[PDB]
Design an enzyme around this catalytic site. Structure first.
Site, PDB file in Angstrom:
ATOM      1  N   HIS A 172       0.819  -1.195   0.000  1.00 35.01           N
ATOM      2  CA  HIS A 172       0.000   0.000   0.000  1.00 35.01           C
ATOM      3  C   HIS A 172       0.847   1.235   0.000  1.00 35.01           C
ATOM      4  CE1 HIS A 172       0.343  -0.679   4.513  1.00 35.01           C
ATOM      5  NE2 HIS A 172       0.837   0.548   4.384  1.00 35.01           N
ATOM      6  N   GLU A 192      -3.533   3.578   2.100  1.00 32.44           N
ATOM      7  CA  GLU A 192      -3.739   3.677   3.527  1.00 32.44           C
ATOM      8  C   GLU A 192      -3.877   5.141   3.867  1.00 32.44           C
ATOM      9  OE1 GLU A 192      -0.493   2.515   6.087  1.00 32.44           O
ATOM     10  OE2 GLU A 192      -1.766   2.706   7.880  1.00 32.44           O
ATOM     11  N   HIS A 216       2.506  11.368  -7.168  1.00 32.85           N
ATOM     12  CA  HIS A 216       1.091  11.079  -7.253  1.00 32.85           C
ATOM     13  C   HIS A 216       0.851   9.599  -7.268  1.00 32.85           C
ATOM     14  CE1 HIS A 216       2.496  11.020 -11.549  1.00 32.85           C
ATOM     15  NE2 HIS A 216       1.889   9.841 -11.491  1.00 32.85           N
ATOM     16  N   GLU A 271      -3.379  10.720 -10.916  1.00 33.36           N
ATOM     17  CA  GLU A 271      -3.381  10.621 -12.353  1.00 33.36           C
ATOM     18  C   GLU A 271      -4.359   9.548 -12.775  1.00 33.36           C
ATOM     19  OE1 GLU A 271       0.251   9.693 -14.574  1.00 33.36           O
ATOM     20  OE2 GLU A 271      -0.809  10.086 -16.494  1.00 33.36           O
TER      21      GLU A 271
END
EC number: 4.4.1.5
Lengths: 128, 128
Positions: free
Chosen positions: A5, A56, A74, A122
């Protein structure tokens, strides 16, 4: 081994949860709270943690603002329709920075938006 | 929809590639250059982009340092051997911020480290 994550701190837990789930189509996989360290977590994704990488969301009790900085870039997500997503995002707590359109020198449709905390996201699109 | 990648800006492309691949066991999936805008990209991960989320490393020509900020948290990865990974990292351009050991209130072995640019990485010893 695998990517589990990406953790991002948010200013308002539910605000973020709402965005990722209601706007981006993810599901709330799980949440937790830690009194010793004073924080709450929310895991959101397009599949179970055992199967995919998720996001998370971390909420530090009483902290509603952070410094985004210039290092972090990003997160990119695939979408069926970038234009539609953009519209949904702009009207639901987000912000569109780069309108949906092909990438220069390419045909792939992309867009750039920001979540409620300003994090950049994005969108990459998968005979009208 | 799916999580494609997390983009991080780095001060030295190769140095980063080396870390993620040689130290973390990732593979160099692909690279690209953009002469027009003066930047180079590298995608590293544990499997093909088509099937899983990866990391996108961005190097802006002539830029060797960024401001980390306080928003971005980290990336968590599963590890075959936490202890072993810490050692390898230790002696391979990285910093071990949290030695491998069972998580607080659990048994799952975890650790925390930093990549060459200071990014935090969590290592977690983790149908069928």
């Amino acid at each position: 081994m695998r990517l589990l994550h990406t953790m991002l701190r948010v200013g308002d837990l539910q605000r973020s949860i709402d965005f990722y789930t209601k706007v981006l189509g993810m599901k709330l996989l799980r949440t937790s709270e830690n009194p010793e360290y004073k924080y709450s977590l929310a895991f959101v994704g397009y599949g179970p943690e055992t199967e995919e990488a998720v996001i998370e969301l971390t909420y530090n009790w009483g902290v509603d603002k952070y410094e985004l900085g210039t290092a972090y870039g990003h997160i990119a997500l695939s979408v069926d329709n970038a234009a539609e997503a953009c519209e949904k995002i702009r009207q639901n707590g987000g912000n569109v920075t780069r309108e949906a359109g092909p990438v220069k020198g390419g045909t792939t449709v992309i867009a750039f938006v920001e979540d409620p905390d300003g994090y950049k996201i994005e969108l990459i699109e998968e005979g009208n």
